[PDB]
Design a protein around this ligand. Structure first.
Ligand code: NFW
Ligand code: NFW
Ligand code: CL
Ligand code: CL
Lengths: 149, 149
């Protein structure tokens, strides 16, 4: 579980917010893209895997699962590309709740930036630093350090 | 120590590569931008600070030190903005060598992507995973985890 991430795509303001969640910690990375293509998703994963030890990614839909560009990025970065089928039905709910929380935070910061991308990074910061007590950013570091040790 | 980062700007293919180095570990984050403006630097720091516990940033030049947009991002993210004067003369050398290493890696991957941005992310990945023994990505996690405990 230290290496398991889940992709998630949500929409706001006619744009797409692509999110990666570290399953065990709830820590997130996100970016704003005009639309979700295999190429965008591939690039996002390359970025993520250079920053954290990404072992497995549960893809957000069947098009990204199928995408040869996404498969090429996962090959390149040594990531096991998996489906995102919620065999544990609780997964759907957690993701839904996370998207609603993220959108809430984006609304709370929306007037502090002209561009949606800025508001999204502000939301990422707030989400990752929120003590719920440890923050998600604290949990991910502890989890991975324990793994190295 | 666990919270100090150094900004660094280097050029390739008529584009700018903006880099943040975690001083204690040598772990890096980087992005390709058309030119180094206060706004680009501010957005980059916002991204970085949402992902790692950024306490202090040594800015890469006086323009980014002066930039009110950069100061506004440092205020927003709770970062102490500092100069990057190399009071320790070893700093210039270390940065220079890192830029040289990064450009070498980018050359080694350059034909595996059409776009420079992709090559740069591949280079970040290789740099952060390289065992020197531990990798920089291992070092940063251990340093921050030790700090949390
Ligand atoms: C499609 N490309 C195929 C290619 C072209 C030439 C040489 C090798 C390859 C190859 O298959 N390499 C191995 C591989 C695939 C994925 C990771 O490694 C790779 C690629 C992917 C995503 C991108 C890219 C690029 C690029 O070519 O630079 O460019 C930036 C873009 C930004 C996001 C957006 O704009 O959608 O995301
Ligand atoms: C300049 N802006 C001032 C502003 C405009 C409107 C409302 C509030 C503010 C304000 O001062 N907010 C507090 C603050 C400043 C920095 C961090 O928080 C903030 C901003 C900065 C960098 C960016 C931005 C934006 C943006 O407005 O969205 O947009 C994307 C861009 C991408 C990189 C590139 O294209 O250069 O980087
Ligand atoms: Cl964090
Ligand atoms: Cl890594």
């Amino acid at each position: 579980s230290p290496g398991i991430w889940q992709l998630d795509c949500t929409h706001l303001e006619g744009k797409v917010i692509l999110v990666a969640v570290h399953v065990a910690s709830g820590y997130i990375e996100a970016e704003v893209i005009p639309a979700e293509t295999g190429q965008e998703t591939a690039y996002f994963l390359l970025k993520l895997a250079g920053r954290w030890p990404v072992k497995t990614v549960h893809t957000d839909n069947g098009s990204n699962f199928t995408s040869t560009t996404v498969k090429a990025a996962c090959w390149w970065a040594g990531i096991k590309q998996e489906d995102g089928i919620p065999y544990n039905p609780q997964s759907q709910g957690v993701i839904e709740s996370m998207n609603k929380e993220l959108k809430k935070i984006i609304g709370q910061v929306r007037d502090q930036a002209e561009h949606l991308k800025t508001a999204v990074q502000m939301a990422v910061f707030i989400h990752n630093h929120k003590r719920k007590g440890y923050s998600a950013g604290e949990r991910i570091v502890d989890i991975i350090a324990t793994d190295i040790q």
